[PDB]
Design a protein around this motif. Structure first.
Motif, PDB file in Angstrom:
ATOM      1  N   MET A 115      60.280  78.063 -16.605  1.00  0.00           N
ATOM      2  CA  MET A 115      59.227  77.180 -16.114  1.00  0.00           C
ATOM      3  C   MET A 115      58.878  76.081 -17.116  1.00  0.00           C
ATOM      4  O   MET A 115      59.055  76.240 -18.323  1.00  0.00           O
ATOM      5  CB  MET A 115      57.980  77.987 -15.763  1.00  0.00           C
ATOM      6  N   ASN A 116      58.370  74.966 -16.596  1.00  0.00           N
ATOM      7  CA  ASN A 116      58.135  73.758 -17.375  1.00  0.00           C
ATOM      8  C   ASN A 116      56.677  73.562 -17.760  1.00  0.00           C
ATOM      9  O   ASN A 116      56.336  72.491 -18.271  1.00  0.00           O
ATOM     10  CB  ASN A 116      58.598  72.525 -16.591  1.00  0.00           C
ATOM     11  N   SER A 117      55.820  74.564 -17.539  1.00  0.00           N
ATOM     12  CA  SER A 117      54.371  74.385 -17.553  1.00  0.00           C
ATOM     13  C   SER A 117      53.880  73.503 -18.689  1.00  0.00           C
ATOM     14  O   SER A 117      53.620  73.980 -19.799  1.00  0.00           O
ATOM     15  CB  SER A 117      53.673  75.735 -17.621  1.00  0.00           C
ATOM     16  N   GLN A 118      53.766  72.213 -18.408  1.00  0.00           N
ATOM     17  CA  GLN A 118      53.231  71.279 -19.383  1.00  0.00           C
ATOM     18  C   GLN A 118      51.731  71.507 -19.530  1.00  0.00           C
ATOM     19  O   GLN A 118      51.007  71.498 -18.526  1.00  0.00           O
ATOM     20  CB  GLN A 118      53.513  69.837 -18.955  1.00  0.00           C
ATOM     21  N   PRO A 119      51.231  71.731 -20.743  1.00  0.00           N
ATOM     22  CA  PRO A 119      49.781  71.836 -20.932  1.00  0.00           C
ATOM     23  C   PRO A 119      49.093  70.529 -20.572  1.00  0.00           C
ATOM     24  O   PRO A 119      49.666  69.444 -20.699  1.00  0.00           O
ATOM     25  CB  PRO A 119      49.636  72.145 -22.428  1.00  0.00           C
ATOM     26  N   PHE A 120      47.852  70.641 -20.106  1.00  0.00           N
ATOM     27  CA  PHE A 120      47.077  69.451 -19.794  1.00  0.00           C
ATOM     28  C   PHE A 120      45.599  69.751 -19.975  1.00  0.00           C
ATOM     29  O   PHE A 120      45.187  70.905 -20.103  1.00  0.00           O
ATOM     30  CB  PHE A 120      47.359  68.942 -18.372  1.00  0.00           C
ATOM     31  N   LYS A 121      44.813  68.686 -20.010  1.00  0.00           N
ATOM     32  CA  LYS A 121      43.366  68.744 -20.110  1.00  0.00           C
ATOM     33  C   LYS A 121      42.761  67.976 -18.947  1.00  0.00           C
ATOM     34  O   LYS A 121      43.455  67.267 -18.211  1.00  0.00           O
ATOM     35  CB  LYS A 121      42.861  68.141 -21.431  1.00  0.00           C
ATOM     36  N   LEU A 122      41.448  68.112 -18.800  1.00  0.00           N
ATOM     37  CA  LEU A 122      40.728  67.297 -17.835  1.00  0.00           C
ATOM     38  C   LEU A 122      40.654  65.865 -18.345  1.00  0.00           C
ATOM     39  O   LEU A 122      40.336  65.623 -19.518  1.00  0.00           O
ATOM     40  CB  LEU A 122      39.330  67.857 -17.592  1.00  0.00           C
ATOM     41  N   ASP A 123      40.972  64.921 -17.468  1.00  0.00           N
ATOM     42  CA  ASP A 123      41.050  63.506 -17.801  1.00  0.00           C
ATOM     43  C   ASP A 123      39.662  62.873 -17.761  1.00  0.00           C
ATOM     44  O   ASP A 123      39.099  62.685 -16.675  1.00  0.00           O
ATOM     45  CB  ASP A 123      41.992  62.790 -16.825  1.00  0.00           C
ATOM     46  N   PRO A 124      39.090  62.506 -18.911  1.00  0.00           N
ATOM     47  CA  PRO A 124      37.769  61.856 -18.882  1.00  0.00           C
ATOM     48  C   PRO A 124      37.752  60.561 -18.090  1.00  0.00           C
ATOM     49  O   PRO A 124      36.710  60.208 -17.527  1.00  0.00           O
ATOM     50  CB  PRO A 124      37.462  61.612 -20.368  1.00  0.00           C
ATOM     51  N   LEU A 127      50.876  77.594 -18.749  1.00  0.00           N
ATOM     52  CA  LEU A 127      51.063  79.035 -18.653  1.00  0.00           C
ATOM     53  C   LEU A 127      52.486  79.379 -18.227  1.00  0.00           C
ATOM     54  O   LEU A 127      53.073  78.686 -17.390  1.00  0.00           O
ATOM     55  CB  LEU A 127      50.088  79.640 -17.645  1.00  0.00           C
ATOM     56  N   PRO A 128      53.050  80.451 -18.766  1.00  0.00           N
ATOM     57  CA  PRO A 128      54.242  81.028 -18.145  1.00  0.00           C
ATOM     58  C   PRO A 128      53.885  81.585 -16.779  1.00  0.00           C
ATOM     59  O   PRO A 128      52.740  81.966 -16.521  1.00  0.00           O
ATOM     60  CB  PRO A 128      54.644  82.144 -19.115  1.00  0.00           C
ATOM     61  N   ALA A 129      54.870  81.605 -15.891  1.00  0.00           N
ATOM     62  CA  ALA A 129      54.670  82.247 -14.601  1.00  0.00           C
ATOM     63  C   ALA A 129      54.260  83.695 -14.831  1.00  0.00           C
ATOM     64  O   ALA A 129      54.910  84.397 -15.619  1.00  0.00           O
ATOM     65  CB  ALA A 129      55.941  82.196 -13.758  1.00  0.00           C
TER      66      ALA A 129
END
Lengths: 165, 165
Positions: free
Chosen positions: A1-10, A159-161
Motif C-alpha cells: 500500500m501507498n498510504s501517503q501521510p497527510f494533515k488537515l489543510d489550513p 496507515l498500513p492496511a
C-alpha cells in the motif's frame, strides 16, 4: 500500500474549525464545517482512519477539486462520503444516498481509497467490518475530506492496511 | 527507527466493568478501571499514543508484573504513570507525584518507552511538546497500562513516532 501521510489543510478548512498544531485534530471553535486533507491522490491504495468519538453528525470521504470548498457532504458529483446522523448511517454521492448498517458504538471509521482499482471503501475497524464500497472509476485526483457540526475529529493517516482488509 | 509493534488490551488484564472493542483498542466505562497491554517489553524503543477524548480522570503508563492487577496508577514502586484528575496533571510513581504543566485541551498523549536507555517519556504530540521524562533503570519487563475513572480511551500502537521525537 501507498498510504501517503497527510494533515488537515489550513487553506481548505472552515474558519469555525480549530486545527491542532500537528494538523491531525480539529474541533469546532449551510451548517457544515468541512476540512480537506493536504494531499491529492491519483494512484495507489491508501488507508486512513478517523476517530470521531461521540460525534453524532459528520461526513467523511473524498472529493475532486471540482467539488467547491466546504461542499464535501456527497451533494455533488465530486464528493463521496460516509455520513452519520444520529443512528442513521448513509453513504452519499451526487445527492444519492444509501443506508448502511453499522454496529452500535461506532467511534472510529476506516477509509480505504484503492485508486488504482476504482474503489472507495468504508470500514468499522474496531469490528474488523466492511461497511460499504463505492465502485468509482476516478477521473481526477481526490483529496480526503472531513466535515462535522460539533465536537472533534482526529485523523490517523499513512496507515498500513489493517490485517483484516 | 522505533521498535513499536501493534499491541492491544490483554483481555485477562481488563477490569470487569470496562467495555472493550473487539480489536482490543478501545476501552470505555459505562474505584479506578485499569487495563494492560498484551505485551511485556524488555528491549528496544517503543512509542504509542492514547486518545483520551473528554475523559477527565485517567492514568496512563507502564508497569512491572509486580504491580498488583488494577494498581497501575503510580501508587507502588512497579507503576509509572501520567495522570489527569480534572484540571490537574501529574506524573506519579511509588506513591509520589509531581505536577506537570500541560497545554490546554490535551486530547492525546504520547508515551515513549525507551527501554534500552532506561527512560519513560510523556508527550503532547498535538503540540510537539515533551511533558515529562522518568529515568528508570528497568529491572523487569514492563507492560503498557491504561486506567480510567470515566469516559473512554483509544490506543494507537505500532504507528511511526512523530518527526519531532
Amino acid at each position: 500500500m501507498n498510504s501517503q501521510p497527510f494533515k488537515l489543510d489550513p487553506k481548505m478548512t472552515h474558519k469555525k474549525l480549530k486545527i491542532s498544531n500537528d494538523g491531525l485534530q480539529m474541533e469546532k471553535d449551510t451548517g457544515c464545517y468541512g476540512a480537506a486533507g493536504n494531499i491529492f491522490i491519483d494512484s495507489g491504495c491508501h488507508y486512513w482512519e478517523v476517530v470521531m468519538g461521540s460525534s453524532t453528525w459528520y461526513a467523511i470521504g473524498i472529493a475532486y477539486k471540482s467539488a467547491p470548498k466546504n461542499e464535501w457532504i456527497g451533494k455533488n458529483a465530486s464528493s463521496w462520503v460516509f455520513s452519520r446522523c444520529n443512528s442513521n448511517f448513509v453513504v452519499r454521492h451526487n445527492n444519492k444516498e444509501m443506508l448502511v448498517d453499522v454496529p452500535p458504538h461506532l467511534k472510529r471509521l476506516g477509509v480505504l481509497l484503492d485508486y488504482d482499482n476504482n474503489m472507495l471503501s468504508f470500514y468499522d475497524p474496531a469490528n474488523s467490518l466492511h461497511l460499504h464500497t463505492f465502485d468509482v472509476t476516478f477521473i481526477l485526483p481526490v483529496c480526503p475530506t472531513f466535515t462535522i457540526w460539533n465536537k472533534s475529529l482526529m485523523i490517523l493517516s499513512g496507515l498500513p492496511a489493517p490485517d483484516f482488509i
